[PDB]
Amino acid sequence: SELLAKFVNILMVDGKKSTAESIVYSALETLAQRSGKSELEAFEVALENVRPTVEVKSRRVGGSTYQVPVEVRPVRRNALAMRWIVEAARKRGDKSMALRLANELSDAAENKGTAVKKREDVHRMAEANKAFAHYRW
């Protein structure tokens, strides 16, 4: 899978991919030991839940800058999902590296936390300005 090959790169600091893949596969191992599910399936679902659909941009239309909702492209949703998962993992308080990734991939499936707060905040900014919906773009 190319998704896993891409996720191991963002965890590659200073070019240590050999050690990077060591923590990744060690996370999927403990992930199946903690949860009765295939490591692969539990992985994909974790990235799917962390993706926005409509992003609001600022634009000067005559007098002031209006916030106009716009659709996001499928190429950026994969990057953000990957990036926000590793950053949230480095936020946990468990010394074990492989454990921080295993738990994060699990909580990401359960849904709840800061990453979710930002998802709701953006979802709220949207629809709140439904009066500017006719500007689908």
């Binding site: 439904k130 009066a131 500017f132 006719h134």
Partner: protein
């Protein structure tokens, strides 16, 4: 609960905010709706979207009355005018005819400050 079945759909379109007022063949308004009635404050009410919601709701409220067909009568220009129309074309009613009964005066009225 007078089951009008058929009536008229007045569309007061304006640059401030469109307002729909469904009525019967006589002219007695059975129910009305507006962007303000939809919850919109006052600046967002003028949007054509706030006109669609006001048109559909004003219609649905009439659906209860039992009306099926209506005659739309557009008045005054402004955003949401055509939006309110198509909004009516849909819903649960059958737009039988559309007419632009926009007054557009003749000669004897002193225009407001904005117009002068």
């Amino acid at each position: 609960r007078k089951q009008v079945s058929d009536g008229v759909a007045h569309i007061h379109a304006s640059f401030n905010n469109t307002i729909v007022t469904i009525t019967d063949r006589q002219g007695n308004a059975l129910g009305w709706a507006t962007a303000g009635g939809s919850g919109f404050r006052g600046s967002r009410k003028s949007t054509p979207f706030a006109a669609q919601v006001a048109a559909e709701r004003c219609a649905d409220a009439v659906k209860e009355y039992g009306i099926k067909n209506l005659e739309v009568m557009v008045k005054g220009p402004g955003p949401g005018r055509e939006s309110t129309i198509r909004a009516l074309n849909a819903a649960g009613f059958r737009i039988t005819n559309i007419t632009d009964v926009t007054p557009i005066p003749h000669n004897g009225c002193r225009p407001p400050k904005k117009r002068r």
